[PDB]
Amino acid sequence: ACPSQCSCSGTTVDCSGKSLASVPGGIPTTTQVLYLYDNQITKLEPGVFDRLVNLQQLWLEINQLTSLPAGVFDNLTQLSILNMHTNQLKSIPRGAFDNLKSLTHIWLLNNPWDCACSDILYLSGWLGQHAGKEQGQAVCSGTNTPVRAVTEASTSPSKCP
């Protein structure tokens, strides 16, 4: 069964461009491609994607996400495509990508990355180790500095919200 707000074909579920404020329920566990882009999603509930063990692509770009729950991608071990550009993210939870050994394309640009805060260090270190995976270049909010180019000295735990 296809979520009533979305359109389904094969293993592709298209929930894009539907003025959604939240992730639809009832996304089938056989889903391989999930489009959620161009909505007004402000948060992800913890564990929202855990049943989608076959998911290879998650398109979250052009939303209003201000953070990601810890572990939100942990069960998506086949994930190769993760698109999160044009959101309101300030950091990535530590270890968020640990299980994602099939990841090959990730979009992080057009987010207000908070590089003064030491929570940025997981993302900046991960980018330094997986350079070919980033599509485009995430940049620190208010500066010319690519997130991958953040120096550890420049960060501080006291500059975090």
Side-chain angles (χ1 to χ4, degrees), residues 127-150:
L127 285 175
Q129 294 178 89
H130 301 97
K133 299 183 182 185
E134 190 181 9
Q135 312 292 297
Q137 200 151 22
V139 173
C140 295
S141 181
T143 78
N144 280 331
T145 300
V147 174
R148 177 176 185 268
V150 166

mmCIF file of all heavy atoms in Angstrom, residues 127-150:
data_model
loop_
_atom_site.group_PDB
_atom_site.id
_atom_site.type_symbol
_atom_site.label_atom_id
_atom_site.label_comp_id
_atom_site.label_asym_id
_atom_site.label_seq_id
_atom_site.Cartn_x
_atom_site.Cartn_y
_atom_site.Cartn_z
ATOM 1 N N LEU A 127 34.292 13.792 6.351
ATOM 2 C CA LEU A 127 34.532 14.320 5.008
ATOM 3 C C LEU A 127 36.000 14.180 4.623
ATOM 4 O O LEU A 127 36.323 13.894 3.467
ATOM 5 C CB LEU A 127 34.116 15.787 4.957
ATOM 6 C CG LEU A 127 32.599 15.968 4.921
ATOM 7 C CD1 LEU A 127 32.259 17.449 4.987
ATOM 8 C CD2 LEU A 127 31.954 15.328 3.681
ATOM 9 N N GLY A 128 36.902 14.398 5.579
ATOM 10 C CA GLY A 128 38.321 14.245 5.286
ATOM 11 C C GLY A 128 38.705 12.825 4.920
ATOM 12 O O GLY A 128 39.665 12.607 4.178
ATOM 13 N N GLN A 129 37.966 11.844 5.426
ATOM 14 C CA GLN A 129 38.270 10.444 5.169
ATOM 15 C C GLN A 129 37.510 9.845 3.991
ATOM 16 O O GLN A 129 37.886 8.765 3.520
ATOM 17 C CB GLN A 129 37.997 9.617 6.424
ATOM 18 C CG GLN A 129 38.927 9.964 7.557
ATOM 19 C CD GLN A 129 38.633 9.184 8.811
ATOM 20 O OE1 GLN A 129 39.158 8.087 9.012
ATOM 21 N NE2 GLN A 129 37.790 9.746 9.671
ATOM 22 N N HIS A 130 36.436 10.484 3.540
ATOM 23 C CA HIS A 130 35.574 9.988 2.470
ATOM 24 C C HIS A 130 35.366 11.058 1.410
ATOM 25 O O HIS A 130 34.238 11.376 1.025
ATOM 26 C CB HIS A 130 34.253 9.507 3.057
ATOM 27 C CG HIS A 130 34.425 8.414 4.062
ATOM 28 N ND1 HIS A 130 34.460 8.648 5.421
ATOM 29 C CD2 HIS A 130 34.655 7.090 3.902
ATOM 30 C CE1 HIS A 130 34.648 7.503 6.056
ATOM 31 N NE2 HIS A 130 34.780 6.546 5.159
ATOM 32 N N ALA A 131 36.472 11.640 0.934
ATOM 33 C CA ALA A 131 36.394 12.869 0.147
ATOM 34 C C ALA A 131 35.573 12.701 -1.133
ATOM 35 O O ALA A 131 34.728 13.553 -1.449
ATOM 36 C CB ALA A 131 37.805 13.346 -0.191
ATOM 37 N N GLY A 132 35.749 11.587 -1.839
ATOM 38 C CA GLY A 132 35.025 11.366 -3.081
ATOM 39 C C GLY A 132 33.519 11.237 -2.937
ATOM 40 O O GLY A 132 32.809 11.296 -3.949
ATOM 41 N N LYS A 133 33.010 11.061 -1.726
ATOM 42 C CA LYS A 133 31.572 10.819 -1.616
ATOM 43 C C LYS A 133 30.756 12.101 -1.656
ATOM 44 O O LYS A 133 29.582 12.066 -2.052
ATOM 45 C CB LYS A 133 31.255 10.065 -0.325
ATOM 46 C CG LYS A 133 31.923 8.690 -0.252
ATOM 47 C CD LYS A 133 31.520 7.957 1.009
ATOM 48 C CE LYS A 133 32.237 6.612 1.084
ATOM 49 N NZ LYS A 133 31.771 5.814 2.252
ATOM 50 N N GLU A 134 31.339 13.229 -1.259
ATOM 51 C CA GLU A 134 30.544 14.447 -1.158
ATOM 52 C C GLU A 134 30.274 14.995 -2.548
ATOM 53 O O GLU A 134 31.186 15.079 -3.380
ATOM 54 C CB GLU A 134 31.226 15.510 -0.286
ATOM 55 C CG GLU A 134 30.245 16.651 -0.020
ATOM 56 C CD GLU A 134 30.763 17.810 0.806
ATOM 57 O OE1 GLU A 134 31.975 17.914 1.104
ATOM 58 O OE2 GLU A 134 29.908 18.646 1.150
ATOM 59 N N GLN A 135 29.005 15.340 -2.799
ATOM 60 C CA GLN A 135 28.572 15.962 -4.042
ATOM 61 C C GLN A 135 28.435 17.453 -3.776
ATOM 62 O O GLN A 135 27.633 17.862 -2.929
ATOM 63 C CB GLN A 135 27.244 15.369 -4.518
ATOM 64 C CG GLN A 135 27.221 13.844 -4.507
ATOM 65 C CD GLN A 135 28.152 13.247 -5.558
ATOM 66 O OE1 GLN A 135 27.965 13.457 -6.755
ATOM 67 N NE2 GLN A 135 29.156 12.496 -5.110
ATOM 68 N N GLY A 136 29.231 18.263 -4.480
ATOM 69 C CA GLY A 136 29.309 19.650 -4.052
ATOM 70 C C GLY A 136 30.151 19.781 -2.790
ATOM 71 O O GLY A 136 30.819 18.851 -2.355
ATOM 72 N N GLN A 137 30.120 20.981 -2.202
ATOM 73 C CA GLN A 137 30.985 21.290 -1.067
ATOM 74 C C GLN A 137 30.225 21.997 0.050
ATOM 75 O O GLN A 137 29.859 23.165 -0.102
ATOM 76 C CB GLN A 137 32.143 22.152 -1.555
ATOM 77 C CG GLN A 137 33.332 22.187 -0.679
ATOM 78 C CD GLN A 137 34.589 22.433 -1.496
ATOM 79 O OE1 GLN A 137 34.530 22.968 -2.608
ATOM 80 N NE2 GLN A 137 35.716 22.014 -0.971
ATOM 81 N N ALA A 138 29.992 21.313 1.164
ATOM 82 C CA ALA A 138 29.415 21.985 2.329
ATOM 83 C C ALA A 138 30.390 23.020 2.885
ATOM 84 O O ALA A 138 31.599 22.772 2.970
ATOM 85 C CB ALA A 138 29.083 20.980 3.426
ATOM 86 N N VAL A 139 29.854 24.181 3.279
ATOM 87 C CA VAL A 139 30.660 25.304 3.742
ATOM 88 C C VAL A 139 30.176 25.725 5.122
ATOM 89 O O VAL A 139 28.981 25.645 5.444
ATOM 90 C CB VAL A 139 30.608 26.476 2.726
ATOM 91 C CG1 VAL A 139 31.312 27.737 3.247
ATOM 92 C CG2 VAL A 139 31.252 26.057 1.414
ATOM 93 N N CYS A 140 31.116 26.203 5.934
ATOM 94 C CA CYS A 140 30.789 26.691 7.262
ATOM 95 C C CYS A 140 29.956 27.962 7.178
ATOM 96 O O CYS A 140 30.270 28.880 6.418
ATOM 97 C CB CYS A 140 32.071 26.958 8.048
ATOM 98 S SG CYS A 140 32.993 25.449 8.342
ATOM 99 N N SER A 141 28.931 28.033 8.018
ATOM 100 C CA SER A 141 28.050 29.192 8.030
ATOM 101 C C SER A 141 28.845 30.457 8.328
ATOM 102 O O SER A 141 29.643 30.498 9.275
ATOM 103 C CB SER A 141 26.954 28.985 9.082
ATOM 104 O OG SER A 141 26.046 30.068 9.121
ATOM 105 N N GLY A 142 28.657 31.481 7.490
ATOM 106 C CA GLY A 142 29.306 32.749 7.743
ATOM 107 C C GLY A 142 30.759 32.848 7.331
ATOM 108 O O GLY A 142 31.398 33.858 7.657
ATOM 109 N N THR A 143 31.333 31.822 6.688
ATOM 110 C CA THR A 143 32.748 31.847 6.322
ATOM 111 C C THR A 143 32.935 31.292 4.915
ATOM 112 O O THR A 143 31.988 30.831 4.269
ATOM 113 C CB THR A 143 33.610 31.025 7.290
ATOM 114 O OG1 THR A 143 33.461 29.640 6.978
ATOM 115 C CG2 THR A 143 33.203 31.266 8.744
ATOM 116 N N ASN A 144 34.197 31.253 4.485
ATOM 117 C CA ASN A 144 34.603 30.700 3.198
ATOM 118 C C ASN A 144 35.139 29.283 3.348
ATOM 119 O O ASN A 144 35.619 28.691 2.371
ATOM 120 C CB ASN A 144 35.688 31.594 2.596
ATOM 121 C CG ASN A 144 35.123 32.836 1.929
ATOM 122 O OD1 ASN A 144 33.995 32.832 1.441
ATOM 123 N ND2 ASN A 144 35.863 33.942 2.017
ATOM 124 N N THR A 145 35.019 28.715 4.541
ATOM 125 C CA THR A 145 35.746 27.504 4.904
ATOM 126 C C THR A 145 34.907 26.275 4.584
ATOM 127 O O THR A 145 33.809 26.135 5.128
ATOM 128 C CB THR A 145 36.097 27.538 6.386
ATOM 129 O OG1 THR A 145 36.915 28.683 6.643
ATOM 130 C CG2 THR A 145 36.882 26.292 6.780
ATOM 131 N N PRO A 146 35.364 25.380 3.710
ATOM 132 C CA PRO A 146 34.646 24.113 3.524
ATOM 133 C C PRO A 146 34.590 23.368 4.847
ATOM 134 O O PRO A 146 35.531 23.425 5.639
ATOM 135 C CB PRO A 146 35.503 23.367 2.485
ATOM 136 C CG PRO A 146 36.191 24.484 1.725
ATOM 137 C CD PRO A 146 36.512 25.507 2.797
ATOM 138 N N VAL A 147 33.462 22.700 5.114
ATOM 139 C CA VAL A 147 33.355 21.969 6.384
ATOM 140 C C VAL A 147 34.509 20.980 6.536
ATOM 141 O O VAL A 147 35.058 20.810 7.628
ATOM 142 C CB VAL A 147 31.986 21.272 6.503
ATOM 143 C CG1 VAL A 147 31.935 20.392 7.765
ATOM 144 C CG2 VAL A 147 30.876 22.318 6.549
ATOM 145 N N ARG A 148 34.928 20.349 5.433
ATOM 146 C CA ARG A 148 36.035 19.404 5.469
ATOM 147 C C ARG A 148 37.359 20.063 5.851
ATOM 148 O O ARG A 148 38.277 19.377 6.329
ATOM 149 C CB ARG A 148 36.132 18.746 4.091
ATOM 150 C CG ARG A 148 37.266 17.766 3.894
ATOM 151 C CD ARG A 148 37.143 17.152 2.524
ATOM 152 N NE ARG A 148 38.126 16.100 2.285
ATOM 153 C CZ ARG A 148 39.308 16.315 1.729
ATOM 154 N NH1 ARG A 148 39.652 17.542 1.379
ATOM 155 N NH2 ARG A 148 40.146 15.312 1.536
ATOM 156 N N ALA A 149 37.458 21.383 5.704
ATOM 157 C CA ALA A 149 38.692 22.122 5.940
ATOM 158 C C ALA A 149 38.755 22.732 7.331
ATOM 159 O O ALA A 149 39.666 23.515 7.614
ATOM 160 C CB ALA A 149 38.859 23.222 4.888
ATOM 161 N N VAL A 150 37.808 22.393 8.202
ATOM 162 C CA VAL A 150 37.766 22.976 9.536
ATOM 163 C C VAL A 150 38.985 22.500 10.304
ATOM 164 O O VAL A 150 39.314 21.307 10.291
ATOM 165 C CB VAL A 150 36.472 22.574 10.266
ATOM 166 C CG1 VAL A 150 36.567 22.882 11.750
ATOM 167 C CG2 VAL A 150 35.300 23.324 9.700
#
